[PDB]
Structures are given as C-alpha cells and as structure tokens.
Write a protein that binds this ligand. Structure first.
Ligand SMILES: O=C(CCCl)NNC1=[NH+]CCN1
Length: 330
C-alpha cells in the first residue's frame, strides 16, 4: 500500500505545515502537524479543556463507531519550543492520503499549552520519529508510520515541503519526478529516538565549503534551522546589520537585506537553502527588524534541521531495518 497527502503552510511565513488526516468512522478530518521530531499522534478533542480550544477542529471519539478507549493509558509531552499537551488515549482508524491504519493510538488532549490554543490552524500533531519516544504510559504506543510500515510497498515516507506553497508527504514510495539529480543517503542513529544524522559541512552564500561534522536531527516539526554558534555566527556575519538580540531571542537582521544562501553537506552532496528561505519576517508587525531563519542551537542541546532546511530538499525517511535519511535537490 501507499499514501499521499498534500501539506500546506499554516501562514505566510511557513511557520508550520498542516496535512489533513481522517480519524474514526465516519471520518473526522483534522489538520495535523506532521512532526518527525516526536512520536505521539495527538488531537484536540471533545475532552480538551473548553477554555483551551479556540477555533480548532476536534476529535469526538463518542461519534466514531471504531473508537475504543485504551484503558488506563495517559500521555504527556513537551516540545523543543516549550509547548506541551497531555491527556488520555483511544485507538481508532486513521487514514493519511488513502493509507489506512486500524487500531492507531489516537492521543486525546485534555490540556494543551497556550501556544497550541493560539494556533487555530493546527488540530494536533502526527509524530513520525521512532516509537521509542512515544509518551503513552504505562504501555508505549507505535507511530502511524511504524504501524503502517509492514503494509507499505517500501518502508519509507518522504517529506517534500514547499516554500510559501503546498507540498507533499508520501508513504510507501519515492516519487522520482519530485526531485532533481539523485538522492544521497546518510546513516541514522536511532539511539535518541530521532532521525539523527551527521552533516558533512556547510557554506555561506558563494563561500568555500567547510568540511566539518554537524550532528543533528531531521525535524519537520521545528520551523527554523538550529546549528552550532560558530556556524551561525559565520552566516550572519555576511549580512550587514545582523546581530544576536537577547531581547528578541535570536539573530535578527534588517528587513531591507537580501540574504545569502546556506549550503549544508549530505555526504559528498550539497543542499542549497536559498537566502529568501531564511527570512522570517518582521519581529513584530511593522518592524524593520526581521527574524533570522538560522539560529544558534546553544542551550537547545541538539542541532535541528528544521523546515528551513528540509523544505530546500526532497527528504526520504527510510525506515528499513537499518534506518537512513535521503536528501535530494529539487
Ligand atoms: O520538539 C521538537 C524538537 C525536538 Cl529536539 N520538535 N517537534 C516539535 N513539534 C512541535 C514543536 N516542536
């Protein structure tokens, strides 16, 4: 089997991407944030504290003839941006783009942090890291991809995120029309539960490529690109007027700037992030200072190849017995 679904930016800055997911019988369609940096599928629901719902579509398990409470199971999660949610758990039928998993753990939120409430476009998250990160207790649950893997034509999914435009998530096949050149595959460590790999280096604009190993994770659920302070300093040094702002919480730059591209190494191959991808717009409405799309990972604890990086590429999340990651230009 295979599945294919369109993923759409939630706003003009590509702050996140939502993908329609069918849950339950008859189908309840929620727009979920596909997140390769976590492993819980959780939804706003009829159980979410009423004051914490503001425009989201909710999952009502009592209206699904296939929903079953998973007795005693609870979940609680915090993400790299400080947001969090928690609740109880049902199993139900979940379909993405024609691909169906019966008995998927659907984690029903009782509480969400303010960041989720304030984002009316995201109805929940669909985690696609490794199931060892799943937060359900006392019985850990499998991701959608994990549950679907055996049935898929090939044990893979691909992320093809658009820059200010719709994109595609495919399960079980590689669309050879969706990228240029060849796919370079690189080894993955599952030891932390993430799609963790090692970039071979970087360049800033037309500069010379620096060979240096950068361990990081491929994370569709993070907006920006978080790299070591040395790398990030080298990038923003090429931008007149750019500075790290403690008050704003990161690198900012004059909105009048044209930004240099940023290249990251995948084995012997190169992915080039266009400069425009690194512009995340005014720090506040009307401001002439703009927030940078490349930020320091210091204090985060891990380097994160977020959407800024992943949307410059066609990305293959290969869940074979020995997982690997594939990157192609597009
Ligand atoms: O939580 C992380 C970072 C793990 Cl190091 N990514 N996934 C995610 N989903 C919502 C915001 N962040």
């Amino acid at each position: 089997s295979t599945g294919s679904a369109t993923t759409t930016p939630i706003d003009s800055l590509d702050d996140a991407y939502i993908t329609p997911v069918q849950i339950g019988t008859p189908a309840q369609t929620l727009n979920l944030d596909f997140d390769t940096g976590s492993s819980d599928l959780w939804v706003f629901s009829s159980e979410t504290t009423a004051s914490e719902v503001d425009g989201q579509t909710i999952y009502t398990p009592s209206k699904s003839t296939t929903a079953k409470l998973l007795s005693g199971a609870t979940w609680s999660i915090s993400y790299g941006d400080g947001s969090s949610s928690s609740g109880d758990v049902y199993t139900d039928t979940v379909s993405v783009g024609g691909l169906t998993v019966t008995g998927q753990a659907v984690e029903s939120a009782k509480k969400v942090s303010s960041s989720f409430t304030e984002d009316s476009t995201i109805d929940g998250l669909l985690g696609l890291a490794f199931s060892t990160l799943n937060t359900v207790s006392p019985t850990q649950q499998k991701t959608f991809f994990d549950n679907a893997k055996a049935s898929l034509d090939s044990p893979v999914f691909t992320a093809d995120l658009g820059y200010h435009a719709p994109g595609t998530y495919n399960f079980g096949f590689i669309d050879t029309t969706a990228y240029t050149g060849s796919i370079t595959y690189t080894a993955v460590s599952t030891k932390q539960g993430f799609w963790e790999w090692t970039s071979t280096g970087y360049a800033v604009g037309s500069g010379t490529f620096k060979s240096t190993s950068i361990d990081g994770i491929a994370d569709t659920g993070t907006t920006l690109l978080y790299l070591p302070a040395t790398v990030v300093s080298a990038y923003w040094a090429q931008v007149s007027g750019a500075k790290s702002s403690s008050s704003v919480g990161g690198y900012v730059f004059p909105c009048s700037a044209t930004l240099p591209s940023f290249t990251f190494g995948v084995g012997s191959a190169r992915i080039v992030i266009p400069g425009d991808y690194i512009d995340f717009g005014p720090i506040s409405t009307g401001s002439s200072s703009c927030f940078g799309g490349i930020q320091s990972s210091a204090g985060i604890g891990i380097n994160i190849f977020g959407d800024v990086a992943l949307k410059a590429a066609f990305v293959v999340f290969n869940g074979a017995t020995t997982p690997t990651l594939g990157f192609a230009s597009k």
